[PDB]
């Protein structure tokens, strides 16, 4: 289980990164999701790691 | 205000681009007749169940999966194989 929080805004970020933020299930700034850790999730996280905070 | 005479360019021509290249992916299912590859000459050769049109276009002859394959050391081909 991973707690993922959108800590920086998507404003001013590329549309591809915004699409990844949406695909992670994050909605508003400081919103959070709890997801099962796996390579696909880790790849999404890695793509947007400058925008999110991850807690195990 | 002072204005100098200008020359002309003898250039400024180009033909329409021909949208060449791959039209279907390796591993993709295609129906018979689907164009696989647009080209000048044989940059890629017709393989199994693939024909070569009068202008070198590569096309499938059967329904099946496209496969781009090595042909010898320097060449390559594209084939279509029927799915089970």
């Amino acid at each position: 289980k991973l707690q993922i929080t959108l800590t920086r805004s998507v404003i001013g970020r590329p549309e591809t990164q915004r699409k990844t933020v949406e695909a992670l299930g994050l909605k508003k700034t400081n919103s959070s999701v709890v997801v099962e850790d796996n390579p696909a999730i880790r790849g999404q996280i890695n793509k947007v790691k400058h925008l999110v905070t991850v807690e195990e | 205000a002072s204005k100098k005479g200008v020359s002309s360019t003898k250039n400024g021509r180009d033909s329409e681009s021909k949208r060449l290249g791959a039209k279907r992916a390796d591993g993709q299912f295609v129906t018979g007749g689907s164009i696989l590859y647009r080209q000048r000459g044989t940059k890629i050769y017709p393989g199994e169940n693939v024909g070569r049109g009068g202008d070198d276009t590569l096309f499938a002859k059967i329904d099946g999966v496209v496969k781009f394959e090595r042909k010898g050391r320097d060449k390559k081909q594209v084939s279509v194989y029927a799915v089970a």
Binding site: - | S2, K3, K4, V6, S7, S8, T9, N11
Partner: protein
């Protein structure tokens, strides 16, 4: 005045100047060399000025090698003309120099003479330079 006897294209895109020297970064013909540390176009006129300065100081005793060559033509528009209406005419020839390239080499003289000659040469050039020896 160096320039190619001919080229296939007289009107060329100006060369990239970012990055480091692709090659010619070592003294390979003489004993001493002048190594560029900054980036610039180097013109045939600048090459000729530096060559004359260093050879005149060396007083024909030693041998000089020009390691760079101005392959690239650059154009310039005629005076006081507006934008457009084709590319301008060839104005000169330049060699692109990036940090590390050896511009000149010298042999057959003492290290002190080589240093003074290459100092005189460097003051003619639009790049910062440093005196270099053969490495081993």
């Amino acid at each position: 005045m160096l320039l190619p006897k001919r080229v296939k294209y007289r009107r060329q895109h100006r060369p990239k100047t970012t990055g480091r020297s692709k090659g010619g970064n070592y003294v390979t013909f003489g004993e001493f060399g002048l190594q560029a540390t900054t980036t610039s176009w180097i013109t045939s006129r600048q090459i000729e000025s530096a060559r004359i300065a260093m050879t005149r100081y060396m007083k024909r005793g030693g041998k000089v090698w020009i390691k760079i060559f101005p392959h690239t033509p650059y154009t310039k528009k005629p005076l006081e003309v507006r934008m457009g209406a084709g590319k301008g005419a060839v104005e000169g020839w330049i060699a692109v120099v990036k940090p590390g390239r050896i511009l000149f080499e010298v042999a057959g003289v003492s290290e002190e003479v080589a240093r003074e000659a290459l100092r005189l040469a460097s003051h003619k050039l639009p790049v910062k330079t440093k005196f270099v020896k053969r490495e081993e």
